[PDB]
Structures are given as structure tokens and as C-alpha cells.
Amino acid sequence: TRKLCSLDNGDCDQFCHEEQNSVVCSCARGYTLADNGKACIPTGPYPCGKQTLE
Amino acid sequence: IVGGQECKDGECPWQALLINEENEGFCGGTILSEFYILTAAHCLYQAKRFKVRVGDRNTEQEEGGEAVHEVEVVIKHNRFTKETYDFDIAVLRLKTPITFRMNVAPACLPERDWAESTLMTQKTGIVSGFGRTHEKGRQSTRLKMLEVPYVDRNSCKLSSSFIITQNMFCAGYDTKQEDACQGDSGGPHVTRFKDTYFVTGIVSWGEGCARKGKYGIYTKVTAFLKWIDRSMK
Ligand SMILES: CN1CCc2nc(C(=O)Nc3ccccc3CNC(=O)c3ccc(Cl)s3)sc2C1
Ligand SMILES: [Ca+2]
Ligand SMILES: [Ca+2]
Known part of the structure; x- marks a missing residue:
């Protein structure tokens, strides 16, 4: 039965790890973990992994 | 393709193109950051000297967004072997940093x-x-x-x-x-x-x-x- 990171990536935007018996989210370089500890917010322009629109 | x-x-936007002395593409790469390109070790044998073009989508036309970078350092995996293509990986450090823009992003x-x-x-x-x-x-x-x-x-x-x-x-x-x-x-x-x-x-x-x-x-x-x-x- 899917638990923690195996259940919808633990609700993380990006990286999910399981520590103690709990989800810990984190983000790629050039992103900051949001106040909710789940979303990843780009720190500057042209963050990695985004298709360009400007 | x-x-x-x-x-x-x-x-x-992360696509890179390795181009030989004739300005023709012979391999791709992936942009990893403003100085670094990921490519295949085997590609390094397909041209004696090469450069990296970014921002290109049509090699027939100049969309003003293309830029060429020279390679400063070639880092080829020391375990690459031609016989099986195992360890087929190299990283290129560029002489000048890539300018991220439309069609150019890591x-x-x-x-x-x-x-x-x-x-x-x-x-x-x-x-x-x-x-x-x-x-x-x-x-x-x-x-x-x-x-x-x-x-x-x-x-x-x-x-x-x-x-x-x-x-x-x-x-x-x-x-x-x-x-x-x-x-x-x-x-x-x-x-x-x-x-x-x-x-x-x-x-x-x-x-x-x-x-x-x-x-x-x-x-x-x-x-x-x-x-x-x-x-x-
Ligand atoms: C160990 N060897 C390494 C090189 C090698 N080349 C072999 C071969 O048949 N080459 C060959 C022959 C005719 C046309 C194209 C190719 C190479 N194709 C590609 O590069 C890819 C297709 C899909 C992707 Cl992903 S890349 S067979 C072989 C085995
Ligand atoms: Ca097939
Ligand atoms: Ca072009």
C-alpha cells in the first residue's frame, strides 16, 4: 500500500525522501522550498527545467 | 529523430548542438548550467575540434537567438569503452557562460x-x-x-x-x-x-x-x- 513518498510523491513539487516515518521535500538547484515545505519556488530568472516563454 | x-x-531550451569545423552538427548535448554541457563520450571521436551552439532550432535560418561557445575543458569518463559504449558520458566546460533566454535554459x-x-x-x-x-x-x-x-x-x-x-x-x-x-x-x-x-x-x-x-x-x-x-x- 502506497505511503509517504510513494503516495503522489508525498505532495512534494520535486524531490521526496522519507526520514523517520515522514515525508521530507526538497528542490533542485536554483529553487527554494516554499513556506509550506512542499512547493519549489524559482530563485532567479531561467530556473532549470522550465520551457521558455520569454 | x-x-x-x-x-x-x-x-x-536545454538542447545543445556540437558543431565541427564545417559548422555542421554531429552530436547533441544538454545544457546543465551557464558553463557546462552534458554529452556522450563517443561523440568526442566524431570531430577533432568542435564548438557548441545553443538556441538553434533551424540550421537553415538565423533567428537571432543562436550563440556559439568554445569548449575550454573536455571531461571524458575514464571508463568509456568503444567496444560496448559503456560509460558513454562526457561533460564540457565552456570558455564563456551561456546567456539564458528564449530557447536557452538548463x-x-x-x-x-x-x-x-x-x-x-x-x-x-x-x-x-x-x-x-x-x-x-x-x-x-x-x-x-x-x-x-x-x-x-x-x-x-x-x-x-x-x-x-x-x-x-x-x-x-x-x-x-x-x-x-x-x-x-x-x-x-x-x-x-x-x-x-x-x-x-x-x-x-x-x-x-x-x-x-x-x-x-x-x-x-x-x-x-x-x-x-x-x-x-
Ligand atoms: C556497442 N555498440 C555501440 C555502437 C552501435 N551502433 C550500432 C548501429 O547499428 N549503429 C547505426 C547504424 C545505422 C544507423 C544508425 C545507427 C546508430 N543509431 C543511433 O545512434 C541511435 C538509435 C537510437 C538511439 Cl537512442 S541512438 S549497433 C552498436 C553497438
Ligand atoms: Ca523499435
Ligand atoms: Ca538557426
Whole structure:
């Protein structure tokens, strides 16, 4: 039965790890973990992994 | 790329093109950061001297967004072997930093365990490049991309006349006439996760292109994340 990171990536935007018996989210370089500890917010322009629109 | 679609404006911004002395593309790369390109070790034997072009989508036309960079340092994996193409990976440090803009942006490097459990277990990834559009053809003048199913590791070994090492994985179609091809070599295999694209493979080799019962063979980038990190410092 899917638990923690195996259940919808633990609700993380990006990286999910399981520590103690709990989800810990984190983000790629050039992103900051949001106040909710789940979303990843780009720190500057042209963050990695985004298709360009400007 | 055999089959697939053109990269439209802004769609494949991490694509790089290695160009020889004649200004012709012979391999791809993936932009990792303003100074670094990921490519295949085997590509380094296809030209004596080369440069890297970014921002290009049509080699016939100048869209004003293209830029060429010279290579300062070539870091080739010391275990690369021509016989099997094992360890088919190199990193290039550029003399000058890439200017990110429309059609020029890095792909994200994922963490190893999450990539293996979560990215490589997705249904598909996306390969792109300026390679041949059929097995016996000329290089594309248009940047193309193609969604490729991840292929079961057992099926892949069974399909192959050559050894599939743990530094390799298989993607594509059993019979559908879509694959990467020669000249896509060295280029990006990325996997989308929630609208963010992570680099997952390097186009490496195949038995022809788009052949029935055969798949595209990619360098498994997760096997080299530490090595890549070291190489970039
Ligand atoms: C160990 N060897 C390394 C090189 C090698 N080349 C072999 C071969 O048949 N080459 C060959 C022959 C005709 C046309 C194209 C190719 C190469 N195709 C590609 O590069 C790719 C297709 C899909 C992706 Cl992913 S890349 S067979 C072989 C085995
Ligand atoms: Ca052009
Ligand atoms: Ca096939």
C-alpha cells in the first residue's frame, strides 16, 4: 500500500525522501522550498527545467 | 529523430548542438548550467575540434537567438569503452557562460534515488535533437523531439544483440516507427515531472533507428550524478 513518498510523491513539487516515518521535500538547484515545505519556488530568472516563454 | 514533432518556440531550451569545423552538427548535448554541457563520450571521436551552439532550432535560418561557445575543458569518463559504449558520458566546460533566454535554459539534475524511483518509473521521457529523420537519411535541419516510453529492463536485454550494462537503459517502441537516430547522439533524454524537466539520459546508440524489436539505448544519467557533480566542481 502506497505511503509517504510513494503516495503522489508525498505532495512534494520535486524531490521526496522519507526520514523517520515522514515525508521530507526538497528542490533542485536554483529553487527554494516554499513556506509550506512542499512547493519549489524559482530563485532567479531561467530556473532549470522550465520551457521558455520569454 | 525519426517521427516525433518539431520543437516549437521555447520547448527544448536545454538542447545543445556540437558543431565541427564545417559548422555542421554531429552530436547533441544538454545544457546543465551557464558553463557546462552534458554529452556522450563517443561523440568526442566524431570531430577533432568542435564548438557548441545553443538556441538553434533551424540550421537553415538565423533567428537571432543562436550563440556559439568554445569548449575550454573536455571531461571524458575514464571508463568509456568503444567496444560496448559503456560509460558513454562526457561533460564540457565552456570558455564563456551561456546567456539564458528564449530557447536557452538548463535542464535540472535530479537526485539519484528520487530519479530512479520516481522519474524513471514514469511512462515516458522525451528525447530531442537534429539527428537523422530515418535510418539511412541526412541530419535534420530542424530541432525535433519525441516522447519515448521507458522500456522494461528485461525486455531490453532480450531485444539487444549487444550487452546492455547497468549504465544504460532503453526507451522507445517495439515496432512503432519512432526513435532517436544517429546525430541525436549525446543529446537530451529528459523526464517531465509537474512541468519541470529533469535530465535522465544521454542519447547513446541503437541497432539502426526505429527497427522492429529494437529500442534506443541511453546512458543512465542517475548512475553518474556524483561524477557529474564532481566534474562541474
Ligand atoms: C556497442 N555498440 C555501440 C555502437 C552501435 N551502433 C550500432 C548501429 O547499428 N549503429 C547505426 C547504424 C545505422 C544507423 C544508425 C545507427 C546508430 N543509431 C543511433 O545512434 C541511435 C538509435 C537510437 C538511439 Cl537512442 S541512438 S549497433 C552498436 C553497438
Ligand atoms: Ca538557426
Ligand atoms: Ca523499435
